[PDB]
């Protein structure tokens, strides 16, 4: 699965 | 909101 | 075109 | 992370 | 299917 | 434009 | 609702 | 950034 | 496949 | 139009 | 929730 | 990368 990154602060992973 | 990153060059934020 | 990034390991581009 | 809502009935969260 | 909601005014369903 | 809603806390609009 | 357009050939609407 | 187009009526831009 | 269009400037296709 | 598939049970089409 | 399928190899579910 | 499937006919891959 791919992991995208976003600033939520702190950077968080978004797993797909 | 979430801020994603993309190369547009320069790295820009993409807010959601 | 925009280029997003994801961890796939190694970081890969994703062009739009 | 954002939580979107959808009817699945009952309403469910969708966490991003 | 999932039914999301959006303001279009009136709140409409968006089926998936 | 459509306006979607998400919990972010508090509920926020997301315009499209 | 929003109507996007795409070539499918022929150009079609895509309603959201 | 990319600018997509949709009928909303009138044709509007959608900037990404 | 579907071909969407966006201004990038110049109008480009985006194939799906 | 493209038709994607999802388990909803039973597998359903999703046309685009 | 809908389950989409993708090849990651092996087929994996993607739950929405 | 992930490869999704859609009916386009024939079943085609859609790589991400």
Numbering used by the authors:
A (entry chain C), B (entry chain B), C (entry chain A), D (entry chain C), E (entry chain B), F (entry chain A), ...: 1 to 16
Sentences from the paper on this structure:
Amyloid-β (Aβ) forms heterogeneous oligomers, which are implicated in the pathogenesis of Alzheimer’s disease (AD). Peptides Aβm17–36 and Aβm17–35 mimic two different β-hairpins that Aβ can form, the Aβ17–36 and Aβ17–35 β-hairpins, respectively. These hairpins are similar in composition but differ in hairpin alignment, altering the facial arrangements of the side chains of the residues that they contain. Aβm17–36 and Aβm17–35 are cyclic hexadecapeptides consisting of two heptapeptide β-strands (Aβ17–23 and Aβ30–36 or Aβ29–35) connected by two δ-linked ornithine turn units that promote a β-hairpin-like conformation.
Aβm17–36 is designed to display the side chains of Val36, Leu34, Ile32, and Ala30 on the same face of the β-hairpin as the side chains of Leu17, Phe19, Ala21, and Asp23 (the LFAD face). The X-ray crystallographic phases of Aβm17–36 were solved by soaking the crystals in potassium iodide to incorporate iodide ions into the crystal lattice and then performing single-wavelength anomalous diffraction (SAD) phasing. The X-ray crystallographic structure of Aβm17–36 contains 16 molecules of Aβm17–36 in the asymmetric unit. Each of the molecules folds to form a twisted β-hairpin, and variation between monomers is minimal, consisting mainly of Met35 and Leu34 rotamers. The trimers formed by Aβm17–36 consist of three β-hairpins in a triangular assembly with a cavity at the center of the triangle. Phe20 and Phe19 sit on opposite faces at the center of the trimer surrounding this cavity. The trimer is stabilized by hydrophobic packing of residues on both faces and by intermolecular hydrogen bonding between the backbones of Val18 and Glu22 at each corner. Two trimers further pack together on the VFE face to form a hexamer. Although the hexamer is not stabilized by hydrogen bonds between the component trimers, it is stabilized by bridging water molecules that hydrogen bond to both trimers. The side chains of residues Phe20, Glu22, and Ile31 form the hydrophobic core of the hexamer, with the carboxyl groups of Glu22 sitting at the corners.
